[PDB]
Amino acid sequence: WTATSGSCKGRCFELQEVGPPDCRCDNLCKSYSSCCHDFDELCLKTARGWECTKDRCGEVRNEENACHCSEDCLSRGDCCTNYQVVCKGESHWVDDDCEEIKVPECPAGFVRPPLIIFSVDGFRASYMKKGSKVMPNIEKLRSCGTHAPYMRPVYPTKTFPNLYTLATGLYPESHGIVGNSMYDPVFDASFHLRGREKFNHRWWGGQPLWITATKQGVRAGTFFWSVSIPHERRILTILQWLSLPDNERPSVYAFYSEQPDFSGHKYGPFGPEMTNPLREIDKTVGQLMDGLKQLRLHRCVNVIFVGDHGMEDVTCDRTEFLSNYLTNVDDITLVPGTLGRIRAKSINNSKYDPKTIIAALTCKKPDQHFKPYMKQHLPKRLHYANNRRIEDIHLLVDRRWHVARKPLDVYKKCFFQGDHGFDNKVNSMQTVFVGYGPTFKYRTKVPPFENIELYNVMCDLLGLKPAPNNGTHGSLNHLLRTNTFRPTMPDEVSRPNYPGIMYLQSEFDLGCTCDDKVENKLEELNKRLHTKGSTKERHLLYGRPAVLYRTSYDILYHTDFESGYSEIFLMPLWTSYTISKQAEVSSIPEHLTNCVRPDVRVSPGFSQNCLAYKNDKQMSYGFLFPPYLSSSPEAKYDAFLVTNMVPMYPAFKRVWAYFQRVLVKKYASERNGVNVISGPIFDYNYDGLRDTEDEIKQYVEGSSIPVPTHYYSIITSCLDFTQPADKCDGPLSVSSFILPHRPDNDESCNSSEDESKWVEELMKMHTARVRDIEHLTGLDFYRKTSRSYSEILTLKTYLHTYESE
Ligand SMILES: *[C@@H]1O[C@H](CO)[C@@H](O[C@@H]2O[C@H](CO)[C@@H](O[C@@H]3O[C@H](CO[C@H]4O[C@H](CO)[C@@H](O)[C@H](O[C@H]5O[C@H](CO)[C@@H](O)[C@H](O)[C@@H]5O[C@H]5O[C@H](CO)[C@@H](O)[C@H](O)[C@@H]5O)[C@@H]4O)[C@@H](O)[C@H](O[C@H]4O[C@H](CO)[C@@H](O)[C@H](O)[C@@H]4O[C@H]4O[C@H](CO)[C@@H](O)[C@H](O)[C@@H]4O)[C@@H]3O)[C@H](O)[C@H]2NC(C)=O)[C@H](O)[C@H]1NC(C)=O
Numbered sequence: 001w002t003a004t005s006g007s008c009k010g011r012c013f014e015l016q017e018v019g020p021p022d023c024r025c026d027n028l029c030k031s032y033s034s035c036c037h038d039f040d041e042l043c044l045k046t047a048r049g050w051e052c053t054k055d056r057c058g059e060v061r062n063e064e065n066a067c068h069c070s071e072d073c074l075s076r077g078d079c080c081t082n083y084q085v086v087c088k089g090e091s092h093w094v095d096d097d098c099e100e101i102k103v104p105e106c107p108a109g110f111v112r113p114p115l116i117i118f119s120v121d122g123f124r125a126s127y128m129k130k131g132s133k134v135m136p137n138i139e140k141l142r143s144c145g146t147h148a149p150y151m152r153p154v155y156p157t158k159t160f161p162n163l164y165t166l167a168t169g170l171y172p173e174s175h176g177i178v179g180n181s182m183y184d185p186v187f188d189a190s191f192h193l194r195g196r197e198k199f200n201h202r203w204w205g206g207q208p209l210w211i212t213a214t215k216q217g218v219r220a221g222t223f224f225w226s227v228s229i230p231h232e233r234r235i236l237t238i239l240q241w242l243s244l245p246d247n248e249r250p251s252v253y254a255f256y257s258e259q260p261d262f263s264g265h266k267y268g269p270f271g272p273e274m275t276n277p278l279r280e281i282d283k284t285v286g287q288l289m290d291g292l293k294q295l296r297l298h299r300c301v302n303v304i305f306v307g308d309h310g311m312e313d314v315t316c317d318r319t320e321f322l323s324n325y326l327t328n329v330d331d332i333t334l335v336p337g338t339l340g341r342i343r344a345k346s347i348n349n350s351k352y353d354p355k356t357i358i359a360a361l362t363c364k365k366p367d368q369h370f371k372p373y374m375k376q377h378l379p380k381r382l383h384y385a386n387n388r389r390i391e392d393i394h395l396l397v398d399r400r401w402h403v404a405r406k407p408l409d410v411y412k413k414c415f416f417q418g419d420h421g422f423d424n425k426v427n428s429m430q431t432v433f434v435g436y437g438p439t440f441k442y443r444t445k446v447p448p449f450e451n452i453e454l455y456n457v458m459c460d461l462l463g464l465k466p467a468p469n470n471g472t473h474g475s476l477n478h479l480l481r482t483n484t485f486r487p488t489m490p491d492e493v494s495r496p497n498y499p500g501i502m503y504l505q506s507e508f509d510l511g512c513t514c515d516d517k518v519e520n521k522l523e524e525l526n527k528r529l530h531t532k533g534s535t536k537e538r539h540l541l542y543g544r545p546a547v548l549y550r551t552s553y554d555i556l557y558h559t560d561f562e563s564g565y566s567e568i569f570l571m572p573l574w575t576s577y578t579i580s581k582q583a584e585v586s587s588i589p590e591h592l593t594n595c596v597r598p599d600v601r602v603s604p605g606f607s608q609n610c611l612a613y614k615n616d617k618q619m620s621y622g623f624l625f626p627p628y629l630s631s632s633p634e635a636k637y638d639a640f641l642v643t644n645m646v647p648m649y650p651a652f653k654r655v656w657a658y659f660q661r662v663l664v665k666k667y668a669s670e671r672n673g674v675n676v677i678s679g680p681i682f683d684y685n686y687d688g689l690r691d692t693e694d695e696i697k698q699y700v701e702g703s704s705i706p707v708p709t710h711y712y713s714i715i716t717s718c719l720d721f722t723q724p725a726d727k728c729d730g731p732l733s734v735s736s737f738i739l740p741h742r743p744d745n746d747e748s749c750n751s752s753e754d755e756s757k758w759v760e761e762l763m764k765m766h767t768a769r770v771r772d773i774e775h776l777t778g779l780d781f782y783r784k785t786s787r788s789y790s791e792i793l794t795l796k797t798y799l800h801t802y803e804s805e
Pocket residue numbers: 170171173174175176202203204205206383386387388468469470687688689775
């Protein structure tokens with residue numbers, strides 16, 4: 001019930017929500033069916049339109065007008081945005097030359113520069129260049145302020161998951177808004193675009209920016225606008241709020257535009273009909289900037305222009321139907337479109353088998369335009385698994401396509417020519433970022449970055465402490481003139497042991513053998529220095545990684561590589577080696593094919609054994625430092641140490657061997673040397689975080705050797721590729737991956753072919769940030785470089801995407 005008999009007089013767009021069954025006058029009342037009887041008359045005035053004209057200048061205040069051109073309007077805070085231009089000979093903001101804003105220039109009583117966040121739905125990154133002729137106001141913010149060439153959204157690249165990521169700094173799996181449509185099995189309740197359930201607070205996790213501000217005593221303007229309130233009125237309301245007394249005035253504001261998304265769905269991202277929506281957005285920006293100028297706030301406010309995702313060409317005839325693959329199509333519920341999520345229609349049917357559904361959807365048609373996954377097998381860069389609302393079965397849909405259950409679903413529900421929601425690496429899904437104001441830099445381009453980073457920067461702009469989030473605080477310091485956040489490196493928790501020779505060969509009973517028994521103070525004093533770390537400056541270029549949790553481990557030195565060996569997991573946590581442009585690839589000689597050698601620095605009790613691998617019919621082994629890259633025949637024996645061995649499925653050994661024999665050398669030739677750090681990852685609970693030992697679900701049969709879920713590599717070189725990787729004076733360049741350690745290659749449909757036709761494509765799909773690997777290992781990399789820490793934080797958030805320009 002709402003007793004809608006109260007009045008909105010003097011309450012229009014009130015800042016605190018009054019509780020039912022009393023009537024509301026706030027910018028959300030319409031959406032709740034709750035506005036007072038007189039809300040439209042008083043609060044949504046339209047008379048005479050939105051602009052002053054010559055004859056309106058100096059007029060007698062008619063309180064019925066939408067905006068005013070009377071003499072008292074400035075002090076009332078309610079002039080039309082063009083008032084001073086038409087009536088007082090002033091220029092539009094866009095016509096003025098840009099001039100650096102070195103300090104905030106604010107009216108008296110302003111305690112901090114206000115923040116205004118202007119969000120645009122479906123604003124694809126290439127609109128900045130392709131629509132530049134019809135967006136003069138946006139182009140001025142962009143060229144005079146700080147901009148990126150694009151900003152990467154989160155997966156799925158849908159509206160509500162991305163808006164809430166912008167608000168919280170969290171991945172959708174953590175904030176809980178995992179799609180535009182959801183079922184929560186604990187609640188037994190459904191979330192939908194249309195309807196009431198979405199308003200229930202239990203859906204929305206984390207702590208959004210308006211809540212962070214309020215808790216810390218910074219006043220926030222209500223972020224959300226009922227759809228029927230026109231754009232011109234939203235702008236005027238913001239400008240009116242900015243005229244409130246010091247004690248009542250908010251410090252943070254939000255404007256949201258449904259365009260250009262609304263038209264892009266109808267006409268496609270570049271339809272001729274798209275020019276007009278772009279013009280109209282620019283005009284809205286013009287009205288805001290003219291309005292701030294009137295209030296002498298145009299050199300005081302920080303303005304962010306940001307999108308949620310882009311838009312791709314997608315039509316009805318590019319739909320794959322699950323009815324062309326599955327016979328039992330009626331026993332399933334599909335969440336459809338630019339991604340797929342599958343679960344059982346009924347929890348009482350015990351004949352539903354996910355295993356057979358996956359197999360029926362796997363590599364079935366030569367052109368197949370989607371790929372099925374168990375959620376824990378999706379590329380770790382998507383961070384899309386750790387939530388009960390995300391179904392076990394997921395379909396990654398090719399760009400330009402849809403998935404549906406049956407043909408009837410499409411024709412009984414072509415309309416659309418655009419859509420979005422695809423893999424967040426896809427060029428058409430990228431969106432925009434511009435920052436303009438006293439706190440942002442002047443005329444500065446910054447590299448592409450992820451939208452998860454922005455919550456921290458918005459907190460910095462408002463002097464707030466961010467709630468815990470998935471940004472890396474300090475990685476966007478390079479966007480700001482001041483208010484930077486001075487992060488410090490995390491403290492190392494465990495220090496390494498440095499073992500010397502402590503065990504005799506005959507103390508080991510590992511069931512391993514090696515053909516190595518062949519017998520000079522020249523090459524004996526030589527091998528000693530190499531085991532004490534004489535070549536360590538060559539192979540460990542950025543310091544040793546720090547271990548950020550409590551554990552027992554050893555540093556092991558060798559001629560060609562260095563490792564941090566875990567006595568708990570019985571394998572390295574990390575292995576570091578450098579391969580110069582000049583380096584030579586050699587084979588594993590015949591007599592050394594099955595060679596595994598005890599390491600006399602490490603006890604039998606803390607070593608793997610070859611017997612477990614013989615008895616384990618499913619599991620084989622590989623090496624972290626590759627024997628193919630040994631510097632000499634004698635150095636090659638180090639690569640066969642039991643302390644360099646890791647468990648590998650035969651199917652995965654195909655991937656790993658191709659990477660190590662062919663790809664490392666290729667990257668070293670292309671990048672002028674590479675430094676490589678490789679290692680295992682254990683994420684059995686798919687939370688993106690390092691497992692403790694009691695979380696491991698699988699061991700090599702009849703042993704305590706734990707099986708990794710993934711293997712990583714971090715591949716670093718000099719950004720100035722005229723310098724070799726091991727003598728680099730300046731910025732660094734990185735690419736990394738987190739490969740799933742799977743007993744089959746069902747993921748790659750072309751895997752019966754030679755590795756040269758499919759392995760590199762798999763690696764690219766599983767590209768990763770250094771920061772992703774840090775979360776998954778409890779390690780901290782790049783501890784000792786000559787670069788500033790903020791620059792290193794930016795490097796650790798970099799993702800190599802493998803999309804064209
Ligand atoms: C990205 O950033 C985020 C934010 O920093 C990272 O997520 C954090 O990670 C922590 C570790 O996983 C986690 O800490 C746990 O908190 C538990 C209490 O959590 C509540 O309180 C916070 C603070 O107000 C709140 O934010 C939480 O909100 C979650 O849950 C509600 C629903 O209830 C949702 O609305 C919301 O969206 C959010 O859901 C997400 O997180 C949960 C996990 O909390 C997931 O299950 C969801 O899928 C979803 O992703 C909560 O309301 C606390 O109980 C935990 O402590 C247990 O574990 C420790 C081990 O140290 C043990 O000592 C304790 O005894 C305890 O164990 C007991 O419970 C077990 C399970 O019942 C049981 O097995 C044991 O036997 C014990 O009885 C733990 O400290 C933190 O909550 C989240 N925060 C958020 C916002 O998600 C995220 O890791 C980052 N991602 C990456 C890749 O870096």
